[PDB]
């Protein structure tokens, strides 16, 4: 089988700026090579066929080059849009193979995250367990801490975090800590509090509530 | 590596 | 146009068998071969197989003794099978379509079927409100949610006011939990003055359980 090396792993451009992908073949495989798109939940969607030839309705920016054990595609003019990963395929050589893919990330100007702070409900404590979120919206780079405190008591272990793919319309990421107790701790207690580091803020962002 | 839950390289 | 429509998502044992459907349109199956490729945490794009025109079958390597292609030309439907699976084999299958008949460069996609492999069983979610309040309002704009909780395989699909609501929406990826149960967030911002003229309704679809759930957001 053919083996295909996509180089590097991670691209990070900022809009406008041309970006290109390398893919190499372990032997030559001519101009037998198709390069794909795949955005955040999608499929695989066909740019370039062949080394170089053009595909309908993708986008005039995308073009492709090379031969041989050398190939090439590229953007002239990175867009937002543009944010996904990028596989190779050659089928010179049965099977047709691919390669294991680049992900192209956008940079942007930072933005502060949105703060804000859900209770469990009534509904989940009836369960007898309570989740506690606290939702830091659209902000850049994606580095940013949450830190959870219980009656000035410091939580650790039993918070779970979760951030969104990178927004394909302005860049931004999003953030979720969810922390996680029994109805009875939660009960025992009165203030609930997110803390919020992140180089967009002057100073932490504490969003809390007290149980009722 | 591949996430199966976002369909991106992680 | 031309599409491919893959059947849902779901679980599967260890050892046991998979078997998805895969209904065309736009085109007929006695005139193009269909292909099946897979994308693994593990080895990522993998092509898999193809039944062609005239139903011969190719299958890769690795797959000869575990795989199946088949086809009912008069209903447009391709049937994929595979035997024996492990765990590592829990990826995303599409099915696929090229250009040309004889050709490999897929330019039609099914939206593929995110197949898990576990011994575990199906669950579906429970969902509770993120209720929008003074404490998830600024500036005007107030965000709400739903958490969806405790389902088990991925995935779940998301979606606000049947579809009419997609601004401002992070549907967050799931993590799974300790008890080997998955959980997420939905959430959107909109304007706090619509919050008392405005219906917020999460539609939560776990597939894996046939669970459908209508969740009313309310501040």
């Known amino acids: 089988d053919i083996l295909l090396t996509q180089s590097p792993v991670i691209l990070s451009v900022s809009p406008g700026e041309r970006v290109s992908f390398s893919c190499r073949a372990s032997?030559?495989?001519?101009?037998?090579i198709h390069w794909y798109q795949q955005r955040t939940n999608g499929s695989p969607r066909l740019l370039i066929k062949?080394?170089?030839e053009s595909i309908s309705g993708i986008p005039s920016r995308f073009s492709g080059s090379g031969s041989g054990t050398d190939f090439t595609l590229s953007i002239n003019s990175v867009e937002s849009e543009d944010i996904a990963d990028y596989y190779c395929?050659?089928?010179?050589?049965?099977?047709?193979?691919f390669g294991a893919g680049t992900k192209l990330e956008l940079k942007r100007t930072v933005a502060a995250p949105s703060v804000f702070i859900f209770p469990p409900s009534d509904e989940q404590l009836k369960s007898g367990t309570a989740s506690v979120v606290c939702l830091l919206n659209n902000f850049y780079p994606r580095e940013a801490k949450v830190q959870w405190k219980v009656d000035n008591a410091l939580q650790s272990g039993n918070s779970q975090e979760s951030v969104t793919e990178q927004d394909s319309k302005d860049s931004t990421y999003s953030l979720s800590s969810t922390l996680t107790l029994s109805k009875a701790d939660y009960e025992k207690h009165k203030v609930y509090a997110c803390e919020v580091t992140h180089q967009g803020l002057s100073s932490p962002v504490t969003k809390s509530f007290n149980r009722g | 590596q591949f996430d199966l839950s976002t369909r991106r390289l992680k | 146009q031309v599409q491919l429509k893959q059947s849902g998502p779901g679980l599967v044992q260890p050892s046991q068998s998979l078997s998805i459907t895969c209904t065309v349109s736009?085109?007929?199956?006695?005139?193009?071969?269909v292909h099946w490729v897979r994308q693994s945490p593990g080895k990522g794009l993998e092509w898999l197989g193809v039944?062609?025109?005239?139903?011969?079958?190719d299958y890769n390597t690795p797959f000869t003794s575990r795989l199946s292609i088949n086809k009912d030309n008069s209903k447009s439907q391709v049937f994929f099978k595979m035997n024996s699976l492990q765990s590592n084999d829990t990826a995303i299958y599409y099915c696929?379509?090229?250009?040309?008949?004889?050709?490999?460069?897929?330019?039609?996609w099914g939206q593929g079927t995110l197949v898990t492999v576990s011994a575990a069983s199906t669950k579906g979610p429970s969902v509770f409100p993120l209720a929008p309040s003074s404490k998830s309002t600024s500036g005007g704009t107030a965000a709400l949610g739903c958490l969806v909780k405790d389902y088990f395989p991925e995935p779940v699909t998301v979606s606000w006011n049947s579809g009419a609501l997609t601004s401002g929406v992070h549907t967050f990826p799931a993590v799974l939990q300790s008890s080997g149960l998955y959980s997420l967030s939905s959430v959107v911002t909109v304007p706090s003055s619509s919050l008392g003229t405005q219906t917020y309704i999460c539609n939560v679809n776990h597939k894996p359980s046939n669970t459908k759930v209508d969740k009313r957001v309310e501040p």
């Open positions: 696929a379509r090229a250009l040309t008949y004889y050709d490999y460069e897929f330019a039609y």
């Open positions: 736009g085109f007929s199956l006695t005139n193009y071969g």
């Open positions: 039944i062609w025109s005239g139903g011969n079958t």
């Open positions: 032997q030559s495989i001519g101009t037998n």
């Open positions: 062949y080394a170089s």
């Open positions: 395929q050659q089928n010179n050589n049965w099977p047709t193979t």
